[PDB]
Ligand binder design. Structure first.
Ligand SMILES: [Ca+2]
Ligand SMILES: [Ca+2]
Ligand SMILES: [Ca+2]
Ligand SMILES: [Ca+2]
Ligand SMILES: [Ca+2]
Ligand SMILES: [Ca+2]
Ligand SMILES: [Ca+2]
Lengths: 87, 90
């Protein structure tokens, strides 16, 4: 939909990126650690601290990252750039 | 460079496009929040009553400014809304 604003397209990409990787194993509604790392490896530039990331994110302790837990991860990455924003 | 990386960059630069217009360059006034919503989201014009309520819900420290952390709660409302749409659609 070309008529979506730049922000709308961004938010859409955040949502589709989750579901692109959550449907590889297990529930398609959640990311396993394997699935998380594969989104991290392929979609981000972050190349034992995953499993620590995994734990910080898994607020319900169910071993899986759902959409609300992934949104917190995205905000972490956003804030890291916002902290040092130079106009 | 990835779509997801450009998306997160957009979250930041959009905030700053409007937060730097007046007052603190790092926070959105009520004016700046209303202008962000008007321009950067499609249709659905927000009434003054609606801006008030969203302002008061986001402004957890009552300084009448929306900082990036408070603004991140709004982005999540929008993501969550589209997630529900994507789930139904798929
Ligand atoms: Ca899965
Ligand atoms: Ca979980
Ligand atoms: Ca979380
Ligand atoms: Ca401002
Ligand atoms: Ca926009
Ligand atoms: Ca505030
Ligand atoms: Ca907050």
């Amino acid at each position: 939909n070309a008529m979506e604003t730049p922000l709308e397209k961004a938010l859409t990409t955040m949502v589709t990126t989750f579901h692109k990787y959550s449907g590889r194993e297990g529930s398609k509604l959640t990311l396993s650690r394997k699935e998380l790392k594969e989104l991290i490896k392929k979609e981000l530039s972050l190349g034992s601290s995953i499993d620590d990331l995994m734990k910080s994110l898994d607020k319900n302790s169910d071993q899986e990252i759902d959409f609300k837990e992934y949104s917190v991860f995205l905000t972490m990455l956003s804030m890291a750039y916002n902290d040092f924003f130079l106009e």
